[PDB]
Design a binder for this molecule. Structure first.
Ligand SMILES: [Mg+2]
Length: 348
């Protein structure tokens, strides 16, 4: 087991390598994979009065969340690019999985599970939906469903499909569509290969080379008091920082929503400056604690997963308050590396 309290992980900010984009892939409106950037949209801010409720629900095509894709689309990319043993000493995951590790020392509400499998040296990490999270997903109240749509809608007001184009929110929001950047990094002694969904690219960004040219878009409720801002800095900026820090996305652009579902204000939060909001806060978060924990977890997983075997899973389970605990599983349902990937890699 691995303890999770922040005090264990205070100390110097560890080494995190400047991320390089190795490539990308797109999922289209039918969730079919394409090894190019067709799904990538372009940051096109107002020059805001955005109705995030517009099109809900008649122009809404939500992804079927029952389909658990796990690492499948990343593994296709890896398979088609394993000529770009560095991989053997790496850990392969989704950006979002690493985000959840980053936020663990401070997370008090949502637990997680991560399946680990070692296969020809490489450590693969793939999130498992917990029974409790599966319960909440199926029991999603109308208001949660509207809120989620609103987050996706915001993007349609802020992005165009061509550089410098005008946003066109008259169409449908279809959440099968995704653009994913594939990045290489390293946290201390742990080489990383991961994909992350990317909201848009800013043509007028100072550095036009990805991932620096990318922008993350967010919505949050409007705030009218120091206390509301302080809770926002403490809870939501931590999540936003941990999401955008990893892939090297330098800006998060937030639209603040009315209780009536309109965005009438925008604010840019540079990733590099987010921690400043809580640096002198007795109940704030700390990016060095986030990264030190993550590095500790990677070391823990790497020493725990001894056997090289794609049918074997070490399930890392964590609930708020407690340590990360481990259980050992084989085959269904936890085994996540598909035959089509294992055989092709074995073929080499
Ligand atoms: Mg976003």
């Amino acid at each position: 087991s691995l303890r999770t309290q922040p005090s264990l992980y205070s100390g110097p900010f560890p080494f995190y390598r400047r991320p390089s984009e190795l490539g990308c892939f797109s999922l289209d409106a039918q969730r079919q994979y394409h090894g190019d950037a067709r799904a990538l949209r372009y940051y096109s801010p107002p020059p805001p009065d955005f109705d995030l409720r517009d099109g809900y629900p008649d122009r809404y095509q939500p992804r079927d969340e029952e389909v658990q894709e796990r690492l499948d689309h990343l593994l296709r990319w890896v398979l088609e690019h394993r000529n770009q043993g560095w991989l053997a000493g790496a850990t392969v995951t989704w950006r979002g999985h690493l985000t959840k590790l980053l936020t663990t020392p401070y997370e008090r509400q949502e637990g997680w599970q991560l399946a680990a499998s070692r296969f020809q040296g490489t450590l693969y990490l793939s999130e498992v939906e917990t029974p409790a999270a599966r319960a909440q997903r199926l029991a999603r109240p109308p208001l949660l469903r509207e809120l989620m749509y609103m987050g996706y809608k915001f993007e349609q007001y802020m992005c165009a499909d061509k550089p410098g184009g005008s946003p066109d929110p008259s169409g449908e929001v279809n959440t099968n569509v995704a653009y994913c950047s594939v990045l290489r990094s390293r946290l201390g002694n742990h080489p990383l290969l991961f994909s992350g969904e990317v909201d848009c690219l800013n043509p007028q960004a100072p550095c036009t080379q990805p991932p620096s040219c990318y922008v993350e878009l967010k919505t949050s409720k409007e705030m009218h008091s120091p206390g509301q801002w302080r809770s926002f800095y403490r809870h939501k900026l931590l999540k936003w920082w941990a999401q955008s820090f990893l892939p090297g996305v330098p800006h998060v652009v937030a639209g603040f929503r009315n209780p009536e579902g309109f965005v009438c204000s925008l604010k840019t939060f540079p990733t590099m400056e987010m921690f400043e909001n809580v640096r002198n806060d007795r109940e704030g978060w700390n990016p060095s604690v986030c990264m030190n924990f993550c590095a500790a977890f990677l070391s823990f997983a790497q020493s725990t997963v001894v056997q090289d075997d794609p049918r074997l899973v070490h399930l890392f389970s964590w609930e708020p308050g407690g340590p990360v605990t481990v259980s050992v599983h084989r085959d269904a349902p936890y085994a996540f590396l598909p035959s089509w990937y294992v055989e092709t890699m074995t073929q080499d």
